[PDB]
Amino acid sequence: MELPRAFGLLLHPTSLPGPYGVGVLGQEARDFLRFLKEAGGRYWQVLPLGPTGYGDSPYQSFSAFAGNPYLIDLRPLAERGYVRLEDPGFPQGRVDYGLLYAWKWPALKEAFRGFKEKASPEEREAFAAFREREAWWLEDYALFMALKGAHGGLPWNRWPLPLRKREEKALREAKSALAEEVAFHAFTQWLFFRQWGALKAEAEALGIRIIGDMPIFVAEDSAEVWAHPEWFHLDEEGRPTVVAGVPPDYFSETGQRWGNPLYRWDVLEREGFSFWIRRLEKALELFHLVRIDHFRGFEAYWEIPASCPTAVEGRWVKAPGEKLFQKIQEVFGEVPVLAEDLGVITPEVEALRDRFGLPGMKVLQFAFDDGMENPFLPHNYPAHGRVVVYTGTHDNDTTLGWYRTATPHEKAFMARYLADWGITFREEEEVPWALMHLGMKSVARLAVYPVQDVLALGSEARMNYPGRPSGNWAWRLLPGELSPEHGARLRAMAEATERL
């Protein structure tokens, strides 16, 4: 496609500076959008914005279409006499999903009740409208959550069979009993998409394109799976017959067992890939470009026997990527998908990605563990520039925290390379800008860099650490940490490297 040479930033809403312990679709986002713009930024990259259960990871969401309530801006509701906002005393620059979970949610069921009372037939109708429009996915979700909650936060595939196997009466009577809890989660979803819809235009106004992200494999315990057991490899108990993951390597002798459920592509294909089409449909509604973690999963996927604790007994299975994207392109005329093809990827994948002109990924933090042959090296990127360069993604340590743990060879081989590209640094705190700058000088059309580096923060500011049992997705931004200085400094490069 056509991704005009430019630079963007990676800042998940949660990391937005804001009162009450978390980032929200509030104006501070608009401030950032103003910052981005000022700094000459044309793109903004965020992680999946779906609801999050334990772990608080945006990739193991309860819904493939639902938005994360946490990211909702509460004050605009308190500004209409809906809910009185307290504050158990949230920490600075770090999300406390424990606190937030126990506070937000309650403070939410409050705003809702504060709505049905003081709400206006303009807000009552608007909300109702959102309900008729987003029916297909919403109904299932609101019921999924309402039930999930009613059943002591238990996975759907453990609820009484009548409900698990989604029976008529069960689903009717349950809905009737929680008619209010259903109206609630919907009300949450409404507020979310509503504010994000505006936040979108705020970005569309400030000449900005937002980049969304979505995991190829859904989450086992999610509305979608529950609602549609037919599409996933699941036994009559709901539990996945097989799970997702990757094969063993020089790193993981055992491999990886993500546990995610696998798609019955045979069925999806028969149904015209209605799940994805519907899925990308929502995507294009929220963002201008959306990425798909683990892209190779479209060419072929590693099938792991649920019963196995590891990924050893796995096997490769071919998936209809060629067909899927033919449908996507015929439905949208375009295929605005950012391919997440890091890690080892076979040519059949490369062919697919390239057959639809899908931009790939390029992370610098990996470009120095070997020789100049390193694919993550600027001089090894494709000419078409249809690739995106990241100093380091969300699943990576901050570049600073990286340079502080990188092997000696890398640290040196780097400065040795940065020089070859007219780039040189002194302090280590400057290294984040070194590679950043380097990323721009590349042929790469887009150069999205995470806010953690723009500020040059240590490992402490690391977003997610694959393997670590917590503290992930916890990092946030402090008031004014993103000063004009930083902006003008980035804009400098943007112009200097003709990205503006």
| 395 is annotated as an active-site residue | yes
Q: Which residues pair with 245 in a beta bridge?
A: 257
Distance (Å) of CA 358 to CA 329, 335, 351, 354: 12, 8, 10, 6
Phi, psi torsion values for 56, nearest 5 degrees: 65, 30
Backbone Cα Rg of the chain:
23
Q: Is the separation of the CB atoms in 323 and 272 below 8 Å?
A: no
Contacts of 381 (CB under 8 A, 6+ apart): 362, 387, 389, 442, 443, 444
Phi and psi torsions of 5, nearest 5°:
-40, 120
C-alpha span between 7 and 361 (Å, rounded): 14
- H helical segments located in 228-364: 265-270, 274-286, 321-332, 347-355
**Which is catalytic among the residues 140, 293, 299, 453?**
293
Which tokens is 41 given? 């930024």
Q: What angle separates helix 408-420 from helix 431-441, to the nearest 10 degrees?
A: 50
Cα–Cα distance, 112 to 104 (Å, whole number): 12
Whole-angstrom distance, CA of residue 436 vs CA of residue 400: 11
340 is catalytic: yes
* Residues ≥6 apart with Cβ < 8 Å to 46: 10, 11, 12, 13, 210, 211, 212, 213
- Measured CA to CA, the distance from residue 138 to residue 127 in angstroms comes to 12
Domain at 209, CATH number: 3.20.20.80
Indicate which residue of 73, 303, 340, 397 is catalytic. Answer: 340
DSSP 315: E
The residue type of 77 is L
User: For the chain, how far is it from start to end, CA to CA, in angstroms?
Assistant: 19
CB 259 within 8 A of CB 181: no
Measured between alpha carbons, how far is 120 from 81 in angstroms, rounded to an integer? Answer: 12
Domain count, the chain: 1
Edge-first strand listing for the sheet containing 446-450: 337-339, 289-293, 209-215, 43-45, 6-10, 446-450, 387-390, 360-363
**Minimal CA–CA distance to 364: which of 350, 373, 375?**
375
Specify the DSSP class assigned to residue 244: E
DSSP letter for each residue of 363-417: EGGGTTSS-TT-TTSGGGS-TT--EEEESS-TTS--HHHHHTTS-HHHHHHHHHH
Cα angle 234, 240, 242; round to 5: 105
Range of the domain at 466: 1-500
Whether residue 446 contacts residue 388, with contact meaning beta carbons closer than 8 Å, is answered with: yes
- The residues, any chain, with a CB within 8 Å of residue 101's CB and separated by 6 or more, are none
Distance CA 156, CA 145 (A): 9
Four-CA torsion 156, 161, 166, 169, nearest 10 degrees: -130
Task: Classify residue 311 by its DSSP letter.
Answer: S
Give the HSE-up count for residue 383: Cα atoms under 13 Å, Cβ half-sphere: 0
Report the distance separating Cα 184 and Cα 109, nearest Å: 7
Known catalytic membership, residue 221: no
* Among candidate residues 278, 258, 281, 260, the one with its CA nearest the CA of residue 268: 278
**SS3 annotation, 151-179:** CCCCCHHHCCHHHHCCCHHHHHHHHHHCH
Residues 484, 244: Cα–Cα separation, whole Å? 44
Contact 46, 29 (CB under 8 A): no
Buried b (16+ CB within 10 A) or exposed e, 375-411: ebbbeebeeebbbbbbbbbbbbbbbbbbbeebeeebb
Two structure tokens written together for 5: 């040479």
388 pairs with which residues across the strands?
A: 361, 446
Q: Are 362 and 393 in contact (CB under 8 A)?
A: no
Cα→Cα distances 103→14, 84, 192, 390, Å:
16, 12, 17, 35
304, two tokens: 């792991």
The residues, any chain, with a CB within 8 Å of residue 397's CB and separated by 6 or more, are: 365, 405, 459, 462, 465
Query: Rounded CA gap, 200 and 39, in Å?
Result: 18
Resolution, given in Å to one decimal, reads: 3.1
The two three-digit tokens of residue 307, written as one number: 């019963």
Options 395, 410, 428, 481, the catalytic residue: 395
Q: How far apart are CA 136 and CA 223, in angstroms?
A: 12
Strand order in the sheet with 315-318: 256-261, 242-246, 300-305, 315-318
Orientation angle between helical segments 179-205 and 123-133, nearest 10 degrees: 90
| CB-CB contact of 474 with 95 (8 Å) | yes
- Is residue 342 helix, strand or coil? coil
CA gap 338, 362 in Å, rounded? 12
d(CA 275, CA 297): 16
Q: Which two three-digit tokens encode residue 252? A: 């993981």
